[PDB]
């Protein structure tokens with residue numbers, strides 16, 4: 001609830017600590033400052049918070065220090081996210097994000113944002129070392145952040161092969177595979193995995209078990225994001241949807257294609273152009289195949305299945321850690 | 331000499347090992363394959379080799395495995411270098427490199443190269459873990475590669491502030507500071523530092539001492555690169571120079587500015603435009619201030635000073651490790 005406020009207030013310190021007794025390079029550190037402030041503030045903080053919330057839920061040993069290390073690693077997750085978005089926005093030619101102008105679209109930034117994004121990545125490891133250098137799960141954390149990065153990158157590769165800016169490539173299997181690698185791992189496993197390691201919980205099986213739960217949650221959450229992109233109330237969301245315009249391998253086109261011949265063709269002409277003549281065409285076709293109802297039915301089945309997953313795979317972790325996230329996404 | 335051949339022949343295995351039993355994502359792994367092959371082969375391999383050469387020189391315990399770990403970490407250095415160049419080329423709008431067409435200029439790559447470059451970064455840590463996960467200097471290696479990345483990025487930031495694509499900013503202090511961070515750390519300290527850790531040599535002081543030697547060597551080597559850019563025989567080099575065209579904070583303009591008023595002005599009009607009317611203008615002005623002779627004299631003083639550095643800072647490491655590099659750059 002309000003806990004999010006306490007997490008954002010810790011951003012000040014994060015930036016202090018990453019910005020300093022070699023004065024040769026101050027101009028660069030100022031620039032880093034600006035990059036962090038533009039690019040790590042603005043969102044909803046759910047992934048960073050998840051680290052903190054999951055840490056409280058998972059430990060007994062909660063000294064002022066122990067906590068600080070939590071809001072730091074949370075901020076690391078946020079930093080990894082900023083690195084990806086800054087880079088994704090360039091790769092996509094996006095205009096806005098959070099809706100401010102994308103960092104790279106700022107006059108005088110342009111493609112320098114590639115280096116800025118790499119700096120954001122690097123700040124992860126500077127933080128870990130600053131706060132996470134004496135603890136025993138230090139190495140475990142570094143490895144997790146690196147593995148999460150790699151997965152996310154592989155997924156982005158997959159995405160960019162699948163959806164260069166042709167519908168044979170939009171399969172279920174491809175779609176699930178993009179979501180798992182591009183989104184689910186860093187969005188759902190990373191934050192909890194990280195709380196796990198902070199809380200002493202380092203076993204392969206526990207992590208695997210948690211992984212199984214969290215990737216499925218990830219899958220649903222991105223499917224819901226795709227549904228809501230088109231059929232969400234724009235002011236319950238704070239957006240209007242452009243998945244269709246952008247030739248995106250959305251879950252709605254996967255399912256539409258599974259249920260199309262002369263509607264295949266109708267999708268050819270209208271998926272991935274810019275005027276709401278042609279967005280209207282597909283939306284309305286989605287309505288005609290009852291994708292909303294397919295979605296309702298998926299959300300019901302998917303929830304059933306997450307709960308079965310929790311019953312089965314959670315112990316000896318507190319089910320609450322997984323149920324907290326579930327309540328929030330569903 | 332020929333040892334370089336044995337290092338390149340180990341690239342095959344490197345790629346094998348980074349390219350595989352999750353078939354959902356093969357299209358992505360193929361793409362990684364292509365990125366590695368285009369972007370890590372082509373250069374002169376000096377930094378990767380330096381790891382291997384320095385490892386042999388520094389250890390007694392050289393089993394088939396011990397060696398393999400050397401040519402791997404060498405390849406890691408090469409991978410870090412590829413990551414930087416791919417990204418630098420985009421940031422610069424370069425046309426060629428190694429002179430093949432820059433990766434990003436390939437039809438169908440474009441700004442997807444940003445993700446490709448991140449993949450190259452990630453492959454560093456995948457390799458370390460594959461070969462460097464049981465050894466005791468594992469963590470030490472990860473930290474070194476991360477620190478080297480950060481330094482290089484900070485330097486690139488500095489460079490991009492200094493030389494956006496105005497001469498008040500071209501100072502000596504700024505120039506030395508760009509070179510140290512952008513070039514010298516990853517080019518000269520990383521490879522040797524890395525051999526050091528592989529060879530058990532992990533003390534703060536030894537590394538600091540080696541650092542002191544190697545950064546100075548780095549400084550000279552980039553100064554020589556700047557001199558040779560304009561005044562090198564183009565066919566002893568395999569290039570012709572465009573430092574001037576590109577508004578670069580070269581060492582030649584630093585020194586030119588230190589020795590200019592109505593020649594300051596003459597530098598204003600002619601530094602950073604594209605026709606060899608105006609490159610001729612500055613070159614010839616460099617000749618008139620005897621920058622070649624200033625350079626000769628610097629190279630003499632700089633060599634004197636490296637040797638003093640070695641005499642003083644090398645022990646208990648074999649001076650040869652530093653002298654080998656010196657002979658080669660000077």
Ligand SMILES: CC(C)C1=CC2=CC(=O)[C@H]3C(C)(C)CCC[C@]3(C)C2=C(O)C1=O
Nearest residue numbers: 042043044045046047081085097098225
């Ligand atoms: C940095 C910022 C824009 C930011 C973006 C977010 C993108 C999402 O996909 C969000 C939703 C999942 C739709 C809802 C909340 C969490 C996500 C991941 C999110 C942020 O938390 C966020 O700070």
Ligand SMILES: CC(C)C1=CC2=CC(=O)[C@H]3C(C)(C)CCC[C@]3(C)C2=C(O)C1=O
Nearest residue numbers: 001002004044046049325327328329330
């Ligand atoms: C500030 C408070 C209302 C609050 C709202 C949230 C909105 C959501 O939609 C939840 C989801 C994005 C669906 C899942 C993550 C948590 C979200 C963002 C959420 C909060 O945590 C939250 O505290």
Ligand SMILES: CC(C)C1=CC2=CC(=O)[C@H]3C(C)(C)CCC[C@]3(C)C2=C(O)C1=O
Nearest residue numbers: 372373374375376377411415427428555
């Ligand atoms: C990947 C490839 C182009 C590559 C580029 C190199 C750039 C340099 O600055 C080279 C010089 C220092 C001028 C001479 C040899 C070493 C350098 C760093 C170098 C490579 O080894 C190299 O493979």
Ligand SMILES: CC(C)C1=CC2=CC(=O)[C@H]3C(C)(C)CCC[C@]3(C)C2=C(O)C1=O
Nearest residue numbers: 331332334374376379655657658659660
């Ligand atoms: C293949 C052999 C001749 C060989 C040539 C080299 C050329 C050089 O200019 C040396 C410098 C780039 C100046 C310093 C690094 C080593 C260089 C590239 C070098 C070799 O190591 C080398 O084996």
